[PDB]
């Protein structure tokens, strides 16, 4: 089925350029669907950014018109967004979605998972991952000192979904994040079953296992 | 562009029926029958629930009714289930050929008091090998979303090295928080006792950890 | 009470592309036609074989409402004995047509900045439609002498063409919503009647 996956840097320097690409799967971008970008600042509401059609048509928020451009790559089967002269106000989760049709707004059916884009003058810092040794017992993964958010934590390369709780990160006084992912398993499986921790930090190309 | 106002919060009780308003202009909600409602669960993309005022997409529960009168859209959720607890956003086409979203509405379904679940993790050998100590207190499944954390070493109060997160709603609508105690490998064996003191609705839960 | 659903047709949120025109059978009801007139300042309202004002006194077996969207330029083709892309390939009225053609500008609803590409029409076809025929086939049109083998490409075109309605277009090129009312009297009891 139709699947949308956003791609792009997680950190953009102030008065820089945000550039994202949504990759359409299970459906040609040449469909009669207005491919749209919608953003959401953390804890704040949704804001429609704009839209694009394969024919080349564009339409953008009057609020951001002067510093936004979108494009279509039919060969790669993806659409793009460029947000020039970025400010801290532009720090948000950027979603790529599509209208149920290529006419007047008819509602957005398919969405991407969202890509958090943090606009800050600070530099990118990779994380330091440490394992956390354990009725029912719990073992975890400490992902200390990273920036910017977020950090993907998988267990057993995706095979372990039950009992997995990744906690929201702590913004330390140093301006760095520390996050913990735990998994509650039975007392028998402790020495009988093997548990690996897959930590991923996209803004630093970090791919560490435990 | 246009301001589309929704009530900030709407609360209900299981089985009850609630209505979220979405008031706008004549250049938006009142001029076109192109209104859409979205349901957004924490940390997930919005879900299309109602399109063109009243039509619900294939697979949406029939308990979601969409209607409009003049310049006001109304999403009605009948027979509320806890899984309906989310943020609801209306949206509409505008005379400017743009789309505008509503302010959002936090819909809350009543839940019983839920006591926290605390887990304490001592500094890992790897952590101590890098000349750092971090004690993590992981609090989960609690309601309402407000706890206070206090740490103790060898039975003694700790006031520096304490970073506690704001409670955030988990998938099951219960809250989760985490307190991090930053120290040194010296201070870690410079004592024998290490305890977390989470106080939720008066009732306090304690967890302790020590090296070996 | 028991009034024929003209609102369901005229006031519909989205209209159909002319190639895929919608029909609505009106039957077993009271048809208050006086509303139709007091409804909107219809840019076009032509009748054939009937007076619109006599319809409240008449009884029909069935009434058919056919809705779709075309350009203002093409509204003149929604008449008997007409020729053009729409009359030939999309919607054909017979010479002996008995009913009314009602059209109105829907630039505010149907045109969009950058184009409204939901509204399509058949640009290519091997022959002309017979009156009231409806062709929905998206089969590849062979423009060249060599066959297509169902594969789109050079000299092999997709039959439908979009309008891409923009508000800045001329009045002739703007979207117009059209409702063609057809009145049918058969050798069966007439069920659709005007109010006394
Ligand atoms: C269409 O809607 C208007 C109000 O928006 C109403 O006054 C009119 O009678 C309706 N037209 C028909 C044909 O029912």
Among B31, B32, B97, whose Cβ lies nearest the Cβ of C113? B97
- Total tally of structural domains belonging to chain A: 2
Q: Could you tell me if B75 and B19 are in contact, meaning their C-beta atoms sit under 8 angstroms apart?
A: yes
The 3-state secondary structure of chain C reads CCECCHHHHHCCCCCCEHHHCEEEEECCEECCCHHHHHHCCCCEEEEECCCHHHHHHCEECEEEEEEEEEEHHHHHHCCCCCCCHHHHHCCCCCCCCCEEEEEEECHHHHCCCCCCCCCEEECCCCCCCCCCCCCCCCCCEECCCCCCCCCCECCEECCEEECCCCCCCCHHHCEEEEEEEEEECCCCCCCEECCC
H or E, element range at A190: helix A189-192
Q: Hey, are the CB atoms on A59 and B121 less than 8 Å from each other?
A: no
**Domain with A146 in it:** 128-209
Mention every residue, 6+ apart, whose C-beta is less than 8 A from residue B201: B113, B144
Nearest-angstrom CA–CA distance, B117 and A184: 12
* Contact status of A57 with chain C (Cβ, < 8 Å): yes
CA angle A103, A109, A113 (to 5 degrees): 130
Atom of ligand 1 nearest to the CA of C10: 13
Reported CATH class of domain B117-208: mainly beta
Tell me the three state secondary structure of residue B189: helix
My answer on whether C171 and C196 are in the same domain is yes
Nearest-angstrom CA–CA distance, C116 and C42: 22
> Can you name the residues that pair with A84 across neighbouring β-strands?
A17
- The tokens of C176 are what? 């117009």
Among B34, B176, B178, whose Cβ lies nearest the Cβ of A170? B178
B19-38 burial, b if ≥16 CB within 10 A, otherwise e? ebbbbbbebbbbbbbbbbbb
Return the sign of the alpha-carbon dihedral for residues B94, B99, B103, B106.
positive
My answer on whether C128 and C182 are in the same domain is no
My answer on whether C30 and C58 are in the same domain is yes
Q: Hey, are the CB atoms on C109 and A102 less than 8 Å from each other?
A: no
- The tokens of B91 are what? 């949206």
Given in angstroms, what resolution was this structure solved at? 2.9
Q: For chain B, how many helices (H) and strands (E)?
A: 2, 18
Name the one residue in this structure whose structure tokens are 């943090």: A118
My answer on whether A103 and A149 are in the same domain is no
- The tokens of C38 are what? 């007091």
- The tokens of B69 are what? 């009168």
My answer on whether C161 and C175 are in the same domain is no
CATH number of the structural domain spanning residue A138: 2.60.40.10
- The tokens of B157 are what? 């109060």
Nearest-angstrom CA–CA distance, C194 and C196: 6
Other residues' Cβ atoms within 10 Å of the Cβ of residue C148: 17
My answer on whether C84 and C162 are in the same domain is no
In this structure, the strands spanning C160-162 and C120-122 are antiparallel
Q: Could you tell me if A127 and A143 are in contact, meaning their C-beta atoms sit under 8 angstroms apart?
A: yes
How far, CA to CA in Å, does C131 sit from each of B173, C49, C82, C134, C136? 61, 17, 11, 9, 15
Strand ranges inside chain A, DSSP E: 3-7, 11-12, 17-25, 35-40, 47-52, 58-60, 68-73, 78-84, 92-99, 108-111, 115-119, 128-132, 136-146, 152-155, 164-166, 170-171, 177-186, 197-201, 206-209
Other residues' Cβ atoms within 10 Å of the Cβ of residue C158: 12
My answer on whether A67 and A140 are in the same domain is no
> Can you name the residues that pair with C46 across neighbouring β-strands?
C101
- Would you call the peptide bond into B185 cis, given omega within 30 degrees of 0 as the criterion? no
My answer on whether A142 and A99 are in the same domain is no
Tell me the three state secondary structure of residue B179: strand
Phi–psi pair at C94, nearest 5 degrees:
-70, 160
Q: Could you tell me if B46 and A46 are in contact, meaning their C-beta atoms sit under 8 angstroms apart?
A: yes
Mention every residue, 6+ apart, whose C-beta is less than 8 A from residue B143: B111, B112, B113, B114, B173, B174, B175
Nearest-angstrom CA–CA distance, B178 and B164: 6
My answer on whether A72 and A16 are in the same domain is yes
H or E, element range at B126: helix B125-129
My answer on whether C48 and C88 are in the same domain is yes
My answer on whether A7 and A107 are in the same domain is yes
Q: Minimal CA–CA distance to A167: which of A185, A142, A145, A197? A: A142
Phi–psi pair at C60, nearest 5 degrees:
-120, 155
Nearest-angstrom CA–CA distance, C55 and C185: 13
Q: Minimal CA–CA distance to A9: which of A179, A202, A190? A: A202
Other residues' Cβ atoms within 10 Å of the Cβ of residue A193: 11
My answer on whether A162 and A86 are in the same domain is no
- Residue ranges per domain, chain B? 9-109, 117-208
Tell me the three state secondary structure of residue A46: coil
My answer on whether A109 and A153 are in the same domain is no
**Is the CB of residue C140 below 6 angstroms from any atom belonging to ligand 1?**
no
Check if B9-109 and B117-208 are the same fold. yes
Q: Hey, are the CB atoms on C115 and A53 less than 8 Å from each other?
A: yes
My answer on whether A81 and A144 are in the same domain is no
**Domain with C13 in it:** 1-114+167-196
Tell me the three state secondary structure of residue B138: strand
Strand ranges inside A42-156, DSSP E: 47-52, 58-60, 68-73, 78-84, 92-99, 108-111, 115-119, 128-132, 136-146, 152-155
Half-sphere exposure of C145 (CA within 13 A, CB side): 0
My answer on whether C82 and C119 are in the same domain is no
In this structure, the strands spanning B156-158 and B117-121 are unpaired
Which chain B residue shows the shortest CA-CA distance from A183? B119
My answer on whether A57 and A79 are in the same domain is yes
- The tokens of A100 are what? 């149920």
Atom of ligand 1 nearest to the CA of C11: 1
Burial-class residue C110 by CB neighbours within 10 Å (0-12, 13-18, 19+). buried
The 3-state secondary structure of B54-80 reads CECCCCCCCCEEEEEECCEEEEEECCC
Nearest-angstrom CA–CA distance, A98 and B181: 45
Domain boundary among A84, A119, A154: A119
Q: Minimal CA–CA distance to B107: which of B29, B165, B49, B57? A: B49
Nearest-angstrom CA–CA distance, A192 and A146: 33
- The tokens of A104 are what? 């007047």
Q: Minimal CA–CA distance to A155: which of A171, A188, A131, A178? A: A131
**Is the CB of residue C180 below 6 angstroms from any atom belonging to ligand 1?**
no
For atom 6 of ligand 1, the residue with the nearest CA is C39
Total residue length of chain B: 212
Tell me the three state secondary structure of residue B16: coil
My answer on whether C134 and C192 are in the same domain is no
Most A-contacting residue of B60, B121, B177, B210 (CB-CB within 10 A), to test interface: B121
**Set of chain A residues whose Cβ sits within 8 Å of the Cβ of C121:** none
Q: Could you tell me if A88 and A14 are in contact, meaning their C-beta atoms sit under 8 angstroms apart?
A: yes
Q: How much distance in Å is there from the Cα of B29 to the middle of ligand 1?
A: 18
Half-sphere exposure of C143 (CA within 13 A, CB side): 10
Nearest-angstrom CA–CA distance, A177 and C145: 68
Nearest-angstrom CA–CA distance, B64 and B71: 20
- The tokens of B40 are what? 């957004």
- Total tally of structural domains belonging to chain C: 2
Burial-class residue A6 by CB neighbours within 10 Å (0-12, 13-18, 19+). buried
My answer on whether C109 and C173 are in the same domain is yes
Partner B, chain C 58-77, Cβ-Cβ below 8 Å: none
> Can you name the residues that pair with A207 across neighbouring β-strands?
A200
Nearest-angstrom CA–CA distance, B179 and A50: 40
Q: Could you tell me if A140 and A182 are in contact, meaning their C-beta atoms sit under 8 angstroms apart?
A: yes
Tell me the three state secondary structure of residue A203: helix
Mention every residue, 6+ apart, whose C-beta is less than 8 A from residue A102: A31, A32, A33, A34, A53, C115, C116, C117, C118
- Would you call the peptide bond into C135 cis, given omega within 30 degrees of 0 as the criterion? no
My answer on whether C54 and C10 are in the same domain is yes
My answer on whether C99 and C13 are in the same domain is yes
The strands making up B156-158's β-sheet, listed across from edge to edge, are: B156-158, B151-153, B194-200, B203-208
My answer on whether C42 and C87 are in the same domain is yes
**DSSP letter assigned to residue B187:** H
Phi–psi pair at B78, nearest 5 degrees:
-100, 150
**Set of chain A residues whose Cβ sits within 8 Å of the Cβ of B34:** 104-106
Atom of ligand 1 nearest to the CA of C35: 9
For atom 7 of ligand 1, the residue with the nearest CA is C39
Q: Minimal CA–CA distance to A201: which of A151, A159, A149? A: A151
Tell me the three state secondary structure of residue B159: coil
- The tokens of B35 are what? 């209104």
The chains in contact with chain A, meaning 3 or more Cβ pairs closer than 8 Å, are B, C
> Can you name the residues that pair with B133 across neighbouring β-strands?
B183
CATH 2.60.120.260 applies to domain B9-109: no
Phi–psi pair at B189, nearest 5 degrees:
-100, 0
Domain boundary among A94, A119, A144: A119
């Amino acid at each position: 089925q139709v699947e949308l996956q956003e791609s792009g840097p997680g950190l953009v320097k102030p008065s820089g350029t945000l550039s994202l690409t949504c990759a359409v799967s299970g459906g040609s971008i040449s469909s009669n669907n207005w491919w749209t970008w919608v953003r959401q600042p953390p804890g704040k509401g949704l804001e429609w950014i704009g839209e694009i059609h394969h024919s080349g048509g564009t339409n953008y928020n009057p609020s951001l018109k002067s510093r936004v451009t979108m494009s279509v790559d039919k060969s790669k089967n993806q659409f793009s967004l460029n947000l020039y002269s970025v400010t801290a106000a532009d720090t948000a989760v950027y979603y790529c979605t599509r209208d149920r049709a290529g006419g007047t707004y008819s509602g957005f059916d398919f969405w991407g998972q969202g890509t958090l884009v943090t606009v800050s003058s600070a530099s990118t810092k990779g994380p330091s991952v440490f394992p956390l040794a354990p009725g029912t017992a719990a073992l975890g993964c400490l992902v200390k000192d990273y920036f910017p958010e977020p950090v993907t934590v998988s267990w057993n390369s995706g095979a372990l979904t039950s009992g997995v709780h990744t906690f929201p990160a702590v913004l330390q006084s140093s301006g760095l994040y520390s996050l913990s992912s735990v998994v509650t398993v039975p007392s028998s499986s402790l020495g009988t079953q093997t548990y690996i921790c897959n930590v991923n930090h996209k803004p630093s190309n970090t791919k560490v296992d435990k | 562009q246009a301001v589309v106002t929704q009530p900030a919060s709407v609360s209900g009780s299981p089985g009850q029926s609630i209505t979220i308003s979405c008031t706008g202009t004549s250049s938006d909600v009142g001029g076109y029958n192109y209104v859409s409602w979205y349901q957004q669960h924490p940390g997930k993309a919005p879900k299309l629930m109602i399109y063109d005022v009243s039509n619900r997409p294939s697979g949406v529960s029939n308990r979601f009714s969409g209607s409009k009168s003049g310049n006001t859209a109304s999403l009605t959720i009948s027979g509320l289930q806890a899984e309906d607890e989310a943020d609801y956003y209306c949206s509409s086409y505008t005379s400017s050929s743009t789309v505008v979203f509503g302010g959002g509405t936090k819909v809350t379904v009543l839940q019983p008091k839920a006591n926290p679940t605390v887990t304490l993790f001592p500094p890992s050998s790897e952590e101590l090998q890098a000349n750092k100590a971090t004690l993590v207190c992981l609090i989960s499944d609690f309601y309402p979303g407000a706890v206070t954390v206090a740490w103790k070493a060898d039975g003694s109060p700790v006031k520096a090295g304490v970073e506690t997160t704001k409670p955030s709603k988990q998938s099951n609508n219960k809250y989760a928080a985490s307190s991090y105690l930053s120290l040194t490998p010296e201070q870690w064996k410079s004592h024998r006792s290490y305890s977390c003191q989470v106080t939720h609705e008066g009732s306090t839960v304690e967890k302790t950890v020590a090296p070996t | 009470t028991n009034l024929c659903p003209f609102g369901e047709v005229f006031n519909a949120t989205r209209f159909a592309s002319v190639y895929a025109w919608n029909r609505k059978r009106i039957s077993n009801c009271v048809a208050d036609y006086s509303v139709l007139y007091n409804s909107a300042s219809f840019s076009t309202f032509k009748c054939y074989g009937v007076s619109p004002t006599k319809l409240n006194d008449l009884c029909f077996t069935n009434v058919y409402a056919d809705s779709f969207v075309i350009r203002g330029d093409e509204v003149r083709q929604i008449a008997p004995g007409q020729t053009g892309k729409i009359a030939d390939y999309n919607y054909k009225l017979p010479d002996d047509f008995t009913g009314c053609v009602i059209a109105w500008n829907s630039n505010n609803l149907d045109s969009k900045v950058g184009g409204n590409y939901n509204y399509l029409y058949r640009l290519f076809r091997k022959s002309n439609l017979k009156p009231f025929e409806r062709d929905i086939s998206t089969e590849i049109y062979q423009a060249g002498s060599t066959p297509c083998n169902g594969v789109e490409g050079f000299n092999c075109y997709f039959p439908l063409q979009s309008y891409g309605f923009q508000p800045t277009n001329g009045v002739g090129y703007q979207p117009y919503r059209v409702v063609v009312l057809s009145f049918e009297l058969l050798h069966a009891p007439a069920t659709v009647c005007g109010p006394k």
